[PDB]
């Protein structure tokens, strides 16, 4: 009962790309992983409704090789079960920049040293709606 | 590079996807694949500019088991190199109905009774811009 998944991507440096998705209005939380494939997320966006011992707070990592890396948990969070969420993604070798429903935006490093992103896939309480690559 | 791949799209009878992309400035040919999986295809969105034969002719088809079926032409061609081009497509019991950039509809059986599409992926010379589902 997973969510979209998505390959070969190509989305290179400098691109956009815009996911947009509702989340479940029974969601604890939700996932939406970017990178070179599973074993491989040069982006695991998780935003935390009440899980894992967190409370609405939105929680990054990076998985290199099937390794979870240090986890960076953000100031803000601009997301609610049961509504569409749109997040815009793009990054450079150094770092991936995520603007979020609010505006926000902020910065997670590049660790895998992607040099660009064709692997996506959001778990079963974000239902992707529309995506694009500008 | 190749063409984007999705999966996991759970798109029930009703619904409809939504896809945008450049058309090459020397396209021959893009396709657009629907269905089960790669081997299993309730649409195979074929336009061909220059190929198989084909000058400026839709083709669409069926694939079951690895085996295409009974190809479909239509009468019209409303796509051309170095421009943006938009198709609908509507998953139906009985039918797919497919909307040409210009509005023009035609609709392809679903020889596979399939009751949910779960894999689309692009080819050829056509980059996708954005993809809608539902
Ligand atoms: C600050 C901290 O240690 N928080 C942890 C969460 O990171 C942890 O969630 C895990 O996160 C990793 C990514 O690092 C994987 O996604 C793993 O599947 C998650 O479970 C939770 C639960 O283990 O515990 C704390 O909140
Ligand atoms: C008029 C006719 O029957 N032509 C066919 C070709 O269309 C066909 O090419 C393949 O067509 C399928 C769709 O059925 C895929 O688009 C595939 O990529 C094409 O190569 C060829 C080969 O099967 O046979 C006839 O020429």
Same mark, same amino acid.
């Given at each position: 009962? &997973?969510?979209?998944?998505? &390959?070969?991507?190509?989305?290179?440096?400098?691109?956009?790309?815009?996911?947009?998705?509702?989340?479940?209005?029974?969601?604890?939380?939700?996932?939406?992983?970017?990178? #070179?494939? &599973?074993?491989?997320?040069?982006?695991?966006?998780?935003?935390?409704?009440?899980?894992?011992?967190?409370?609405? %707070? $939105?929680?990054?990592?990076?998985?290199?090789?099937?390794?979870?890396? %240090?986890?960076?948990?953000?100031?803000?969070?601009?997301?609610?079960?049961? &509504?569409?969420? *749109?997040?815009? $993604? %793009?990054?450079?070798?150094?770092?991936? %920049?995520?603007?979020?429903?609010?505006?926000? *935006?902020? #910065?997670?490093?590049?660790?895998?040293?992607?040099?660009?992103?064709?692997?996506?896939?959001?778990?079963?309480?974000?239902?992707?709606?529309?995506?694009?690559?500008?």
């Amino acid at each position: 009962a &997973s969510g979209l998944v998505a &390959s070969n991507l190509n989305l290179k440096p400098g691109e956009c790309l815009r996911v947009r998705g509702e989340v479940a209005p029974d969601a604890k939380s939700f996932v939406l992983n970017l990178g #070179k494939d &599973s074993n491989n997320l040069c982006l695991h966006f998780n935003p935390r409704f009440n899980a894992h011992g967190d409370a609405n %707070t $939105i929680v990054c990592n990076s998985k290199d090789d099937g390794a979870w890396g %240090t986890e960076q948990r953000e100031a803000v969070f601009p997301f609610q079960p049961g &509504s569409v969420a *749109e997040v815009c $993604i %793009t990054f450079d070798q150094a770092n991936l %920049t995520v603007k979020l429903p609010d505006g926000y *935006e902020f #910065k997670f490093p590049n660790r895998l040293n992607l040099e660009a992103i064709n692997y996506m896939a959001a778990d079963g309480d974000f239902k992707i709606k529309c995506v694009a690559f500008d």
